[PDB]
Design a protein around this ligand. Sequence first.
Ligand SMILES: [Mg+2]
Ligand SMILES: [Zn+2]
Lengths: 63, 118, 50, 1477, 189, 76
Amino acid sequence: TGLGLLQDSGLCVVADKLNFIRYLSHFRCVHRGADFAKMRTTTVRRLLPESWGFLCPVHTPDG
Amino acid sequence: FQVRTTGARDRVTNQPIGGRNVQGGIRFGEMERDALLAHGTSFLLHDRLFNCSDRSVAHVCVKCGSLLSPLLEKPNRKYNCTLCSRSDTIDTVSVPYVFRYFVAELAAMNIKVKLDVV
Amino acid sequence: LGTGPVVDRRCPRCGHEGMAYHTRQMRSADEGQTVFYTCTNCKFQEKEDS
Amino acid sequence: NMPWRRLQGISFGMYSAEELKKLSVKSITNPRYLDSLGNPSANGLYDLALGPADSKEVCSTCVQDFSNCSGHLGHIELPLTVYNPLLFDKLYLLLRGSCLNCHMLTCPRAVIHLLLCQLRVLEVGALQAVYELERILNRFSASEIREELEQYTTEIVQNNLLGSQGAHVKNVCESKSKLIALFWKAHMNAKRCPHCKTGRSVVRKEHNSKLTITFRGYLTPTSAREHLSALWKNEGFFLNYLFSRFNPSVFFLDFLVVPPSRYRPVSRLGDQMFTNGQTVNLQAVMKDVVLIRKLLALMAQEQSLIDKLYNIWIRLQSHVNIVFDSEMDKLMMDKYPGIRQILEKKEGLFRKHMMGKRVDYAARSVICPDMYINTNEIGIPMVFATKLTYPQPVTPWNVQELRQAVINGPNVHPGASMVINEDGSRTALSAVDMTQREAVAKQLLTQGTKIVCRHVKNGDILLLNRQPTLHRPSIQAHRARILPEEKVLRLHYANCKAYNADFDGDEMNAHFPQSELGRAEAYVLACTDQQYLVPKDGQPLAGLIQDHMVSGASMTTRGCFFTREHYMELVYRGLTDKVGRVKLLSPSILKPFPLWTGKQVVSTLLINIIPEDHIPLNLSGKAKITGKAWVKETPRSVPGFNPDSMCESQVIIREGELLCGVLDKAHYGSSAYGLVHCCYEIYGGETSGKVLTCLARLFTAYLQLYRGFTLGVEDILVKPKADVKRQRIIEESTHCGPQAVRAALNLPEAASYDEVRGKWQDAHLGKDQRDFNMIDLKFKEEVNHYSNEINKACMPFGLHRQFPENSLQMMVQSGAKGSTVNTMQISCLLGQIELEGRRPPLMASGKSLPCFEPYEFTPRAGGFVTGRFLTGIKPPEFFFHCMAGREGLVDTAVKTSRSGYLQRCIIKHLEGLVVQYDLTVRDSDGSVVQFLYGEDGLDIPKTQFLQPKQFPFLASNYEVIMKSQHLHEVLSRADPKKALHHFRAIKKWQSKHPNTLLRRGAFLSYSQKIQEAVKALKLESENRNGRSPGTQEMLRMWYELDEESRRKYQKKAAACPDPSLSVWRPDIYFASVSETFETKVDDYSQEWAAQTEKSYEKSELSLDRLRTLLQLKWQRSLCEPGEAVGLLAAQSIGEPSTQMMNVTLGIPRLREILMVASANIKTPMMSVPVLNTKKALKRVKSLKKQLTRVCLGEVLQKIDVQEQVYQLRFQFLPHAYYQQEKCLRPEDILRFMETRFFKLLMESIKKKNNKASEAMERRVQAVREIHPFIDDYQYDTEESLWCQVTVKLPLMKINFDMSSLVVSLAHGAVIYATKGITRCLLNETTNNKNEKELVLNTEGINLPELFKYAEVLDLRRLYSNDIHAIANTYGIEAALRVIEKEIKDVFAVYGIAVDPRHLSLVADYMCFEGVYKPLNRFGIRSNSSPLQQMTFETSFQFLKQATMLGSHDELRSPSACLVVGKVVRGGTGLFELKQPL
Amino acid sequence: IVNKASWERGFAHGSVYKSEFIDLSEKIKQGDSSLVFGIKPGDPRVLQKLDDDGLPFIGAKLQYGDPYYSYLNLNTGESFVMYYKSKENCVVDNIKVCSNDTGSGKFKCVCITMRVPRNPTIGDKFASRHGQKGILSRLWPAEDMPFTESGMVPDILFNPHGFPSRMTIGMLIESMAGKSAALHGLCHD
Amino acid sequence: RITTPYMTKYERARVLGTRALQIAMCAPVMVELEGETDPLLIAMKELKARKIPIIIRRYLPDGSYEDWGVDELIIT
RNA sequence: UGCUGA
DNA sequence: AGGACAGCGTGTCAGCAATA
DNA sequence: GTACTGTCCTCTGG
Ligand SMILES: [Mg+2]
Ligand SMILES: [Zn+2]
């Protein structure tokens, strides 16, 4: 049973101490899902106004 | 930073290996050959691909046009055609290895590639 | 029964006297913002790079 | 000594299966291929007779080692026959349509013989014979049909032989493709048998590896093989043509071929050190063969045993399938990818290792700015230079410098790593003893000479490439300037825009030609100064950038004075002259103190660069910096002064000396017609490169020595007393939400302050969501009024420092970097945020951000940012700005992903189109696409100065242009009589016929007696044969009552002479130019002979020398033979898209047009002008109201359904608010319900119930005459008061809320509409020149349903974006121009402008064969190249096709020429050299 | 642009630590121990590059082609020098000898740490705290730099054309804030 | 006899390349070289003097060809 | 497969 | 012959770890 | 993703 998850990869990742600002950002990251990296429509990438105070507007990978 | 001259030639296609750890070549690509022929520099596009990549010197049954047919005697080592027993028809043709690899792959299905030598 | 020109700054293409611009950042995070101009007398759209 | 033998042709066929034998060194039988330790197990897949897989061993078949042995083939002999997976599907059809009893196809012999004869004629090329045979048939026993067709077919094949070589052309492959496809698609279905009526032994195949004949038996490949063997016998004459002399045996396999072991290399996989995916599939086949060979022996030592035999058969087929196509069989595992996956994909074998090989002698490193090496040079960092080696032959005139190289050694720079011997090879010098290198420095010149592999020697030619290669200018050749101690490749900044390099970590590749024949082409063709103009629109590509533009604009300004010593040391530092005296100037100011001007520095730098023999150029143009940028203080009226006669806006170079103008980006830049563009025209591309280099050096020395450029905070600051107005305007902008939204919902003008919030909420939670976008749009408007008021307050004159002295202005204003919208948005406003063309989205509760109340009217809540980057933006505005900046990046990624594919498809279809030696644009097979490249020749980059308005430049610089290029030699070696006489004839004709659409004719010309006849002659008759009483008199007088040979009304009515380019070969015929160029030349000669008269300057040029000059400059701009213009058109349509309101825009539209060629487009439209007559204007109102669709649902209030007796009252709307613009009446509307809705209702009731388990009287009666359910409706004698109906199904029906059905049906029920038109609209004005124009645009497409209004609307000037509808009402030559105009209008919305000569070629290729054909995977089926067409997409379907048809390839495409290692047949390879003996 | 004297006085010098775990249970399967770091006495191959346990000296410099380890198949009695193949210079700074988790391992696993000096060359990417990235294109001599009226001389030269299109007005404020801080001994937020 | 009299740029490129590959293989130089070690500079020197005995064989799209002399071809 | 660079 | 539908498709560019 | 080809699928015409 997939554990009621919907994702079966990228569940754990390497935490790299290149800097202490790369390391501290692994324990505050939130991944919408690894399947959404393959989608024609871009609507799970919209920065809605309901993530005010819960997700940072600026801190997102830029590729 | 990478510079490759010659080095690991991939065995399946006789082409430079790639990566940076070994000599590592630079894939040319399908997008770039188009620009090189727009300039009408056919010979630069010939020299680069054929001579810096898989340039091979295969033999053909000129009468029957098969790459697979020519044969070497066990040690003179004069080529003789297996399909038709003629030894003086065989002559060399410049061709790639991936061309030979493709003739082999097509035979792996009973398909025949008959080629006209001139 | 009962119960879009932009801010418009001045630049010419065919005639003169005032286009109108929409700014959109149609670029990456290492670049700057592109500008979209539109004329008044006619309707000719520009689409610069900055 | 190379093989010397070349390839002419490659054909794909099928191997006999008996000739594969003797193509086999041994049969393999041992399953386990890997030895206990990892070596080859004897008789396994990896064997030593199938070749040495690795260098360790020697083959048993021929003694020879790896790298010298061509591998050998072997065969897993199968226990019993299996079907071949590629020829399998066809087999199925060959068994579906056939009588297993009779063994004959169920097709009428008419079709069989017709198709047989059509194929017989196609094999030789005859293409009219196809339809001729079909019509001969239709106009006509089995022998009877055969003899009727075979006579004609043999006559064709005999009289039209000698054409077997001229049959491999498009239009001959499309016909055969279509014929055989139609056959397989329409005539191979299961049918009752002709001869025996009961011969349908229905073969019906389950998943592959399974064919089941009925009385549900399992078809054994042996029974199917015998069926095919006995069907061929009866129907072979026909199938030998449908398949090539195919033997039916080829459809079945009795062995599998194991490819040579050198092509199957053991790597590793999880928990397995030595495994190839191909050997793991072949091992599975060998293992099943072994289990099956055991069961056969079990039968021999003798339902489960044979059920097991039939199950292991199906398993052996699903493995032999997987061996051919990994995904043919979906129910098996341990399935590694087959050959379809080895060949056919982006990873593949064609798009990798075939078109994209990896190359030796190449480097890649980060690129760094240089600027002190000439524009044609690259800096090499002494680490590539010591490794990159050119293999030069040793000869008497180089043996000295080569000797120093072998002595310098492998590691010192002018050295060499090796020397190849005459017969031997590769004696490496890399030793560092320094004595053996000297021992071998001798014996050079001591057959083919020794070749020294020398290093790069500071003059070599290198090809440089940046990886997103989107145009020809992305690969250019450079001149190897060697630099010591670095690992970066240094490149001039003029070559940046060409590559798109940015010096932020920008790795770039450098290739080193090794042939001495690719060096000649890198020097002549690929050089980086022949690349000055982009091939997209001919505009310059190389130019100076950034601080070379702010430096040159501040030095060439009027108040820059230099002393003798700053004048000098600024001239010599730009020149660095090496040859000859630097010619200087005289001080402009000679007295109080000798002083120079800065324009004089540029002047004196310009007269030294221009070549000594040639003379300085004259030039007149405009500057980028407007003459209004300098107006500090209000301009006062000077009575007699034209301020622009003496302005810094007009650039005036007079004999190489700048006399006026600033010389900003408009020159030195990437703008056309500037100083460097004219230098490149008159004096060549090397002189323009020299000018660029020297001007860069001069403008750097200026800023580095005497001036300086910076950008502080006091040039982005804004004056106080100007920020007060900004603040008050921002305060005013915080009150414009209620009015905006309200007046967009058309609400009561006031008195509602909460009804507006509710209406906004309703519009937000609505389903259509187009009354919400209305509010969004009418809101980004009051906010935009305040910004205009805000930018105007601060940016022009509210800045603390103004343009001459502001550093931000003078950087965006001279084209250096940036824009006035960057300058603003740094000061005084950031703007209105827009994500998808709309404001930021709201939450699910109606608030856009947690800080804002739900449904808040303030523009701030919708993304209107009034903050600037000067004084930062608040958190809520930060959020919206981040949303926008992030959508930008997402869109970039996706856009590039789509553009890459579009461009790949285009380039893969238009690649073989090259200009031939007869100036005609032909494809690879000779098919004429165009008879003249741009419709006139004249490649793009050379036609830049042939425009008018550039003649006053060619006239001013006439002496330089004749001396530098054409010279007096060509002008007097020209003979223009043939072409000049033709133009005189054309001019005389057009003089006698002013209106060229007036129906010229001999007899028509003999209607001037019209009065002579109408007077008295014809007054007595009727329409004898329909013509007239008076027309017969004219016919009689003309017919034979006129002179025999002197009735020459013909000459007064003859055609215009055909254009000169058509008859007189523009290349070898002087003065033969285009009909639009000679008109321009006439106009300019007439406007130039009337300027010399009042000129106060002596002109030593005559109108008839200027004419010859222009004619030569035309004849020389003529698209050299071999140009390969289709690739240039592909790349010119691709690059702009890859980089970059009720219609479609962007790549969607380009893909609709080019790649899909759809008959269904998202936004079809029309536009007919309105005829400009008083009656037409009145009729159009009714016309618009006549074509809009009125649907039952658009006219309804609400239904009232009662329920098995289901009543229904429609309750229609009053006419007050729908008859105004719909042209409807209530009797028609109600009559509609009686005849269409009330019977479609029973139609839908049956749709549900089939799978469920005085005058009122006549109308009601006829209506229930037709249906048995209704009882009685109603009548409404007063405006449809109450109009219900009643139904009843009394026995048993599913009584539910059927309102659902009668509501889902009362929406798609339309009263009446013109087919295809959804709405019209009259966009009042479309012109300023003749503003009086009116246009009746539409949002549907029906061309004929407008032909009825040829008096209300102009049906010439009718336009539509459909291109398939135009191609069906007006033809294909009319769809060409619609295609071209559509592409042009798609590119126009972004300011891009592709040259018309490219769209002409694209449209001519798309519409080549009579139909609008898509430029995609289905367009290549009509292509004469199997090797192409499989290097594109679906490579295995195109290989199966080419194989079952015996399709032959001529090796004339670029792809087929690069697959077999030939030289492409365009550009440099288009001719021989033929050394004479 | 980076001043050359600033770069020679230690501006932005750096290093990389490449730790390589050599577990030598590879090169062999479950047979006899072919794995013990060790040097057969007198091997001409490792005359003075290893230190009698087939491990480089701590502090030694390594270059391509230098000896890097020497196993010894205990039964046969044969050594294998295993040369250093990276085309870059480093210094060995530590070597951990590890056991098997039961304190019973036999000199089969080691971890060598090499130190690679990576000072700012030409082609290295620098950045500010405002997204203004850029490679290092020159090292401008310290006597060719524009000196100020206070005797100072910049150590970074930043072209003023990255501001107009990128609108990073925070860099122009950070410059003034940091200059005021360095002047007054303060620390602004 | 009907094609253009001038030498297209592709023809110049291929003729220079072939003459250079010949010179480099020890062919006699009919141009009196003056101390230059590049075979391509020598080939350009020969093309400017009108000493190249090569025959450009221009192929038409139907197989028909026309044989032009490198001397009888207007080099721009 | 997770990263990273244009 | 009005459909219903099952069926193929592509997708810029190079590196590293690491592991099937 | 959508739109294309394809594929029959078998419904009223001689
Ligand atoms: Mg970059
Ligand atoms: Zn043979």
